[PDB]
Amino acid sequence: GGSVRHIAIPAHRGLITDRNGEPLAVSTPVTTLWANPKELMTAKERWPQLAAALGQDTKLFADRIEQNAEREFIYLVRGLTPEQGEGVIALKVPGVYSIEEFRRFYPAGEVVAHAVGFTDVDDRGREGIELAFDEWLAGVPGKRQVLKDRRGRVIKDVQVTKNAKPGKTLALSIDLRLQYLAHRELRNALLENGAKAGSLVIMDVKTGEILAMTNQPTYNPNNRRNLQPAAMRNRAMIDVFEPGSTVKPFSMSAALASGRWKPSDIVDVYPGTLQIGRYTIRDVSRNSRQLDLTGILIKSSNVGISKIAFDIGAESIYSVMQQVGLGQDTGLGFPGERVGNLPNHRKWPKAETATLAYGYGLSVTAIQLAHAYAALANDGKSVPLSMTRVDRVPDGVQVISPEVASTVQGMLQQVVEAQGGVFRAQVPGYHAAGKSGTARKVNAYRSLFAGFAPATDPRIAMVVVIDEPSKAGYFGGLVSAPVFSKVMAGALRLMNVPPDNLPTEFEA
Ligand SMILES: *C(=O)[C@@H](NC(=O)/C(=N\OC(C)(C)C(=O)O)c1csc(N)n1)[C@@H]1N=C(C(=O)O)C(=C)CS1
């Protein structure tokens, strides 16, 4: 007797590695016990011992089987060892079956959870890379012919009609060594500042590769028990924030490209405030009069950058920030990734011109901010972003001219190295460049640092975001700059970049 039926052959999900082959998401065998209730209903005498072997109350187990008496498949328990599955099979209960199924394990756990994401119990990607590249990773299930008796029990395997096709291996752009370093130091910074959250992005300025992307809080994707959704946010891609002063190098790029400004030109910022009708632009350091363009960045003078913006026009500044990608679609396609907002106007009055120029009222992601600094470091050329390992580098787009980019690079090196600069961002053994930011949330603060290294031949761009530090310190040059120093120092050494901060003949 029996009936001819076709059943599926699950496909083996593809391995996800870092850029060097280190396993990040692996489908490994676990032993699973399942049951056909229609068969179980013929051997009720065996139920209590089966319940006991499954750690179930006898009556709760007997109730569950009765409530599913019309189904032909229920799970008993998933994730045993082969030895554990055999002990239950040794009861020889009709309708109880053991199978080996491949389920996801994440060997680096919380360290790359936001980037990698996870699959559901149907093993379909639902977060992070697992979702974004689900088609690549999933493969194609097969089909095989069976004969089933009246209860649904397979009584003969007839033939395979189509073989399963396994999913494909995927190598991410992430370097797990940099990821671990970034993860540990971001975690340390949250403790030292009693901060609520944070992000750290590392990018290869020559290839567009996202070398590291970590956030706090994070979660263990191997133990998703009562996960708070806040811990699951890949903030670097799905949270927007005001970049504030960290956009001032792009305002400065527009200034230098206009033909009306050189680094040694001077701006009077006395007395540290600038009234624009009912609005008042304010500096924190208000013991300045004449500042040159590098000093405007070193002191992070909102007044100074605003006066420059009045001279060159907001349109030139908006265009640079648009070109380097701030508030613009990255095109990556990460689930929930935000585009943000670069505010636009028909005509730009002084107030809107000033706030644009020092990053007030803008919305960007940490990925966008890092990509913009990568283009600046790469002599003004923006290489497309990638979450996967890049073997053939695609052509970039020139978004800032090489001469202007090179001059702004040198100014940003001075921001880190010059007297009164952001000395905590200095990278031991290397010349580094960057810009701090401190944004008041609308007192709560967000502490920023963005930069790149080595200055002589940039390789890595990095953004550090510390959300709501609660200690006495909250300025970006105190809170986020030291994280940049430690992570950049380690990342450059892990990538075997030759140190470039060597004495001249006279300094030796
Ligand atoms: C650049 O980020 C500048 N930040 C600001 O003007 C902002 N806030 O300034 C503080 C002092 C935090 C305030 O409470 O007003 C700002 C920009 S967008 C936003 N929502 N707030 C300057 N940056 C620095 C740095 O280099 O971190 C300073 C040292 C002084 S303020």
Curated annotation (Swiss-Prot):
**What's the name of its gene?**
ftsI
What pathway does the UniProt record associate with this protein?
A: Cell wall biogenesis; peptidoglycan biosynthesis
One GO MF annotation is: serine-type D-Ala-D-Ala carboxypeptidase activity
Q: Where in the cell is it found?
A: Cell inner membrane
What name appears for this protein in its UniProt entry? Answer: Peptidoglycan D,D-transpeptidase FtsI
Enzyme class, top EC level, equals: hydrolase
User: Induction: what does the entry report?
Assistant: Mainly produced during exponential phase of growth.
- What species is given as this protein's source? Pseudomonas aeruginosa (strain ATCC 15692 / DSM 22644 / CIP 104116 / JCM 14847 / LMG 12228 / 1C / PRS 101 / PAO1)
Q: What Enzyme Commission number(s) apply to this enzyme?
A: 3.4.16.4
> Among the record's GO biological process terms, what is one?
proteolysis
Q: What does this protein do?
A: Catalyzes cross-linking of the peptidoglycan cell wall at the division septum. Binds penicillin.
Catalytic machinery residues: 245
One CC-aspect GO term = plasma membrane
